[PDB]
């Protein structure tokens, strides 16, 4: 994010009490779970500077409910599932 | 109305020169270059009987012009109040300017700071905390001006002068230390400013060390002008702990206000060394002995209980004390500062973890890479 | 408001013989009558009488938030005896019991309000019962922090720290260990006695789940490290 992304949230704060901006990534490369989440908050500082906004990082997770599971779970058609107990835990030990 | 400003046109030699332009500014009916030129005359030190008379015409301007921000009206009223010498009639007129002016920009923050600046002679303690509490409450939205927060420090510092919870003065002076961007004022004031700041911040009981913010880069140039006994004893409270020569040297340098908090400082450094003794060693090996604490803190074996357990109440360590051999078992630690050449060794402790996991994990799946396919 | 005044009649029954716990919330019920008052001596003596029975009741989880409800009031701190009573409760540590006798021995001469000395020391047998109760409460206050810090201790050092004989240490350790508040280990002949510790599975919960509970912060290290890093880097 460039430093100008703050005022966008400050403009739409009239729409929602707290607007969370989500950085995303169109091309997967690194390092892991894509995108990002930043919430608009005023933390001031321990140095007592005039209040400025440095967006705090919000942890992002990927999930689904029912139909959004149906689409992607059929769309994988790539790697074995899971398989539980053998390759799963050890590849996670690598990654 | 014109003759009212014509009789005040001449304040002395050279004044009517620029005042020939000043009177030509309202003929074109521009009150802004007029605002900057009049405010410059108000900022110009005078008797001053010129601004006291012409403030009614400037009030007449604000009447039909209905616009010009109260900021300039606060800047002129703080110059006039010095010549008025009576804060009461100044409070009636300033609160009149507060109720008679309204704009999208909040005028309550600039008026309450002007009232707080004029409240020093009331003398204090009655309505102070109420309006002082209202300043930063109305400043929370939207603090983009940056100018009034220094005035908030002015009324908050004069609120602290009653003494006044020393521990709070460092937080308020922190607010000032971060409020103003460029100092743009002689260091001869800021050397004693950061001096009594170092006194009230060090003598505070809520802060036992905070050696980190002692190294803050904007105040370190102010400490360079200060004598080095204060900086060295601040390093004693940064690390120390005893270092009995430096904690006495601050008594050589600063006589007053130290006699009351001296024993508090001794307790603060006695609980300060407990984190640094287990932090300095590679350890852990976090179990210490009574001989280590009693020799360092030079206190009797009966008071080391109160010593280490008070640090457990401070929150810097959760450890437990083994009283059979009188040993002290520390747990966790309170991080305070650290240093240069530490980012390097940090890369050594990291890269070793890197090649560890890389090697071993690449050995794990090296065995089972075949069977996968 | 006569029914509220009947509480002052029933406090004689609840405080009379065996219950120091029943006066906890009920002395706060009689405290509501001075709230309507319009009184000075009875109001101020109600503040001290309601703040001085904390030692009477045994230690319990309800006693903590109880004294925390009354703590913070602007009228309460006016008495230096409340400063000492609060000093011993918060942060604990150690204070000489003779100094506690100094502050609690002047309350007979102190006053103004004689009502706390009437409820506590007004009766000879009840006063002595609250003397030994005070002894048991201050030694249990010492045991509470010390037991959590043991590990181990010595018998002779316990005698000089508790300011009482070794047999009195075994007596106070006996009636505290039958209360099963702290499981101790006490052998006087070898001189090595110890309090706590778990006493857990412990091979699974303690060693495993706690160590890798710190590995929660170890795998979250870089997560919040790069966070606060970017925080200080963006604003300046």
Q: Which of A45, A47, A54 to mutate to test the interface with C (most CBs of C within 10 A)?
A: A54
Query: C111: which residues sit within 8 A by CB, 6+ positions away?
Result: C117
- Terminal Cα-to-Cα distance of chain C (whole angstroms): 64
CA distance A51 to chain B (A): 6
Question: Which residues in chain A have their CB less than 8 angstroms from residue B140's CB?
Answer: 51
Q: Which of A49, A50, A90 has the CB atom closest to B365's CB atom? A: A90
Question: Which residues in chain B have their CB less than 8 angstroms from residue C149's CB?
Answer: 309, 320-321, 323
Asked if B327 and B292 count as a contact pair (C-beta separation under 8 A), the reply is no
Query: Are A56 and C223 inside 8 Å of each other by CB?
Result: no
SS3 C213: helix
CA C199, distance to chain mean position in Å, is 26
Among positive and negative, which fits the CA dihedral C222, C227, C231, C234?
positive
Structural tokens at position C169: 């240490």
- The H or E element that residue A68 is part of is helix A67-75
Question: Which residues in chain C have their CB less than 8 angstroms from residue A49's CB?
Answer: 235
Query: Are C157 and B322 inside 8 Å of each other by CB?
Result: no
- How far is B193 from B173, CA to CA, in rounded Å? 9
- How far is B280 from B271, CA to CA, in rounded Å? 15
Q: Which of B168, B174, B359 to mutate to test the interface with A (most CBs of A within 10 A)?
A: B174
Of B127, B52, B63, B41, give the one whose Cα is nearest residue B86: B52
Query: Are A48 and B368 inside 8 Å of each other by CB?
Result: no
Q: Which residue of B has its CA nearest to A95?
A: B361
Q: Which residue of B has its CA nearest to C193?
A: B324
For strand A38-39 and strand B287-288, is the pairing parallel, antiparallel, or unpaired? unpaired
Query: C84: which residues sit within 8 A by CB, 6+ positions away?
Result: C100, C103
- How far is C146 from B323, CA to CA, in rounded Å? 9
Q: How far is CA C165 from CA A31, B61, C144, C214, in A?
A: 66, 88, 19, 43
CA distance B142 to chain C (A): 17
Q: How far is CA C77 from CA A47, A85, C35, C55, C68, in A?
A: 34, 63, 17, 18, 13
Quoted resolution (Å): 7.0
Query: Are B176 and A48 inside 8 Å of each other by CB?
Result: yes
Q: Which of A46, A47, A87 has the CB atom closest to B372's CB atom? A: A87
Residues of chain C numbered 198-227 and touching chain A (CB < 8 Å): 223, 227
Question: Which residues in chain B have their CB less than 8 angstroms from residue A50's CB?
Answer: 143-144, 146, 149, 178-179
- How far is B274 from B206, CA to CA, in rounded Å? 17
- How far is B118 from B131, CA to CA, in rounded Å? 12
Among positive and negative, which fits the CA dihedral B273, B275, B279, B285?
positive
Query: B155: which residues sit within 8 A by CB, 6+ positions away?
Result: B113, B116, B117, B119, B128, B131, B132, B135
CA distance B360 to chain A (A): 10
């Amino acid at each position: 994010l460039h430093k100008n992304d703050i005022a966008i949230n400050e403009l739409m704060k009239r729409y929602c009490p707290n607007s969370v901006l989500v950085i995303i990534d169109v091309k997967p490369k690194d390092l892991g779970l894509p995108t990002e989440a930043y919430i608009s908050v005023e933390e001031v500082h321990d140095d007592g500077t005039p209040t400025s906004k440095t967006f705090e990082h919000v942890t992002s997770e990927i999930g689904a409910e029912e139909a959004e599971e149906v689409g992607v779970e059929h769309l994988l058609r790539d790697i074995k599932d899971t398989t539980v107990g053998t390759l799963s835990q050890r590849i996670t030990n690598q990654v | 109305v014109p003759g009212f400003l014509q009789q005040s046109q001449s304040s002395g030699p050279g004044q009517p020169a620029v005042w020939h332009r000043l009177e030509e500014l309202y003929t074109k009916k521009l009150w802004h270059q007029l605002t900057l030129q009049v405010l410059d005359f108000v900022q110009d030190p005078c008797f001053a009987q010129g601004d006291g008379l012409i403030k009614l015409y400037e009030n007449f301007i604000s009447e039909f012009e209905h616009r010009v921000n109260p900021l300039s009206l606060v800047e002129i009223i703080l110059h006039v109040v010095r010549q008025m010498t009576d804060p009461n009639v100044a409070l009636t007129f300033l609160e009149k300017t507060r109720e008679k002016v309204k704009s999208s920009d909040e005028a309550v923050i600039l008026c309450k700071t002007a009232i707080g600046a004029l409240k020093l002679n009331i003398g204090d303690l009655q309505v102070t905390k109420e309006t002082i509490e209202d300043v930063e409450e109305m400043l929370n939205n939207l603090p983009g001006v940056t100018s009034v927060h220094s005035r908030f420090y002015d009324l908050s510092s004069k609120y602290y002068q009653t003494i006044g919870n020393h521990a709070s003065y460092y937080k308020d002076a922190l607010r000032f230390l971060g409020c103003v961007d460029i100092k743009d004022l002689p260091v001869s004031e800021q050397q004693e400013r950061a001096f009594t700041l170092g006194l009230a911040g060090l003598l505070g009981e809520g802060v036992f060390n905070f050696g980190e913010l002692l190294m803050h880069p904007v105040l370190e140039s102010l400490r360079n002008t200060d004598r080095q006994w204060l900086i060295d004893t601040l390093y004693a409270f940064n690390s120390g702990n005893v270092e009995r020569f430096q904690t006495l040297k601050t008594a050589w340098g600063q006589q007053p206000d130290l006699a009351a908090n001296e024993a508090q400082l001794l307790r603060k450094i006695q609980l300060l060394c407990l984190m640094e003794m287990t932090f300095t060693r590679p350890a852990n090996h976090r179990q210490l002995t009574f001989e280590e604490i009693a020799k360092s803190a030079k206190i009797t074996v009966n008071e080391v209980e109160l010593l280490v357990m008070k640090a457990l109440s401070v929150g810097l360590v959760k450890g437990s004390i083994d009283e059979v051999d009188k040993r002290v078992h520390m747990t966790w630690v309170q991080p305070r500062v650290l240093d240069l050449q530490q980012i390097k060794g940090m890369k050594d402790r990291l890269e070793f973890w890197c090649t560890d996991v890389k090697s071993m994990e690449m050995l794990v799946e090296h065995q089972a890479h075949d069977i996968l396919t | 408001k006569l029914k509220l005044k009947y509480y002052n009649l029933m406090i004689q029954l609840d405080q009379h013989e065996g219950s120091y716990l029943s006066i906890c919330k009920h002395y706060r019920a009689i405290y509501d009558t001075p709230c309507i008052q319009a009184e000075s001596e009875k109001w101020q003596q109600a503040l001290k009488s309601v703040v001085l029975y904390v030692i009477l009741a045994p230690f319990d989880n309800e006693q903590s938030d109880l004294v925390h409800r009354i703590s913070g009031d602007k009228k309460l701190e006016e008495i230096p005896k409340y400063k000492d009573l609060l000093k011993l409760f918060t942060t604990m540590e150690l204070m000489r019991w003779s100094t506690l006798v100094e502050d609690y021995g002047m309350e007979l001469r102190k006053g103004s309000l004689e009502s706390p000395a009437t409820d506590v020391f007004g009766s000879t047998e009840e006063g002595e019962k609250r003397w030994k109760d005070l002894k048991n409460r201050v030694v249990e206050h010492n045991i509470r922090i010390m037991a959590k810090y043991y590990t181990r201790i010595t018998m002779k050092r316990m005698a000089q720290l508790l300011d009482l004989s070794v047999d009195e240490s075994e007596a106070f350790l006996s009636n505290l260990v039958v209360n099963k508040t702290i499981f101790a280990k006490v052998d006087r002949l070898a001189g090595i006695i110890n309090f706590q510790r778990p006493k857990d599975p412990n091979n699974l919960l303690n060693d495993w789940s706690q160590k890798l509970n710190s590995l929660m912060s170890l795998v979250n290290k870089t997560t919040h490290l790069i966070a606060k890093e970017e925080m200080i880097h963006n604003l300046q």
